[PDB]
Ligand binder design. Structure first.
Ligand SMILES: Nc1ncnc2c1ncn2[C@@H]1O[C@H](COP(=O)(O)OP(=O)(O)NP(=O)(O)O)[C@@H](O)[C@H]1O
Ligand SMILES: [Mg+2]
Length: 326
């Protein structure tokens, strides 16, 4: 029944936990299936079937405890985090029963068109809901470590979003010194440099997502960790000297004179100063009411995209920003 890799071979029409009748797909190789709960008047549910093996089962149980913690902390469901209904085992696989949702934000952008992006009013509502998710994430001692359009789901009417996929989530007391934490394009500079990180990494990831939600394009589509720093410095300039010294992977990107080494058949180029060339306003941009809102988003992105997490806009200040309050 289980694959060599550890995946479960799902069947359309199969009944899970003697109640969940699987009727459709959402995404296969953990496999997420759409089911109807026969015990609860055929109500729609999403069942996440976690991969077997050894390492995947550990992350599944880790996902279970984090979702339970966030759900108990938010009884009224006003902090936009995915709702776990219950859990069961099926043919050695841990199965998580979730609230049913329509599509992820990556899927909605594809339906919006090639580099079209969402309407400024939708981006405004989505940002507030994402900032509310960060508030609950910070209230609990949880780091999502994978905020991106693929991991944010929306309801049928596309009015309510939910932060999903807590498979790569971690506790704040846990400080794993890894430069590969968070999907590369949404990876904060403090992860890459090897600096002590906190809730700011999730804030950075939200900023990358908010630019992508309006433009339909990835903010920093870097090939490697070094290219990610170059693209981040192409907007805000060179990283502050006090931040570079605090890191662990200092030597891998910066020399003894604190100058950045850009990689382009190896090709290494020494850079003393990086001038801010990337124009957010030009890349983001019709009516005066909408134009004023794009300018407010631009100022909010400037405050989120600060290289030093200590200079980064807080969750409360992001919620109170002119772009949200109108
Ligand atoms: N509650 C849900 N309702 C409807 N679809 C869901 C739900 N949760 C997940 N999905 C779908 O399944 C996809 C992947 O789910 P996810 O939680 O990311 O499992 P995963 O594939 O193991 N993790 P990953 O692909 O690394 O983010 C999501 O992008 C959705 O398309
Ligand atoms: Mg997947």
């Amino acid at each position: 029944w289980t694959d060599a890799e550890g995946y479960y071979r799902v069947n359309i029409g199969e009944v899970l936990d003697k109640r969940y009748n699987v009727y459709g797909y959402t995404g296969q190789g953990s496999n997420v299936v759409r089911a109807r709960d026969n015990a609860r008047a055929n109500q729609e549910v999403a069942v996440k079937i976690i991969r077997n093996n050894e390492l995947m089962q550990k992350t599944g149980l880790k996902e279970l405890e984090f979702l339970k913690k966030l759900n108990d902390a938010d009884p009224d469901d006003k902090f936009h985090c995915l709702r776990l209904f219950r859990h069961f085992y099926h043919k050695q696989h841990l199965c998580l029963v979730f609230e049913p949702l329509s599509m992820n934000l990556r899927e909605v952008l594809k339906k919006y068109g090639k580099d079209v992006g969402l309407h400024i009013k939708a981006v405004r509502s989505y940002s507030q809901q994402l900032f509310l998710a960060l508030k609950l994430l910070k209230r609990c001692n949880i780091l999502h470590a994978d905020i991106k359009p693929d991991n944010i789901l929306v309801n049928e009417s596309k009015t309510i979003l939910k932060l999903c996929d807590f498979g790569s989530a971690s506790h704040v007391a846990d400080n794993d010194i890894t430069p590969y934490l968070v999907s590369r394009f949404y990876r904060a500079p403090e992860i890459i440099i090897g600096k002590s990180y906190d809730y700011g990494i999730d804030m950075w990831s939200v900023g990358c997502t908010l630019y992508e939600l309006y433009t339909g394009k990835i903010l920093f589509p870097g090939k490697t960790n070094n290219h990610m720093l170059k693209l981040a410095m192409d907007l805000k300039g060179k990283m502050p000297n006090k931040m570079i010294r605090k890191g662990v992977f200092k030597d891998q990107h910066f020399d003894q004179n604190l100058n950045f080494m850009y990689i382009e058949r190896e090709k290494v180029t020494v850079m003393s100063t990086i001038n801010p060339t990337k124009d957010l306003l030009a890349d983001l941009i019709l009516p005066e009411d909408q134009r004023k809102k794009v300018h407010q988003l631009k100022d909010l992105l400037d405050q989120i995209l600060m290289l030093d997490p200590a200079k980064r806009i807080s969750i409360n200040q992001a919620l109170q920003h002119a772009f949200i309050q109108e």
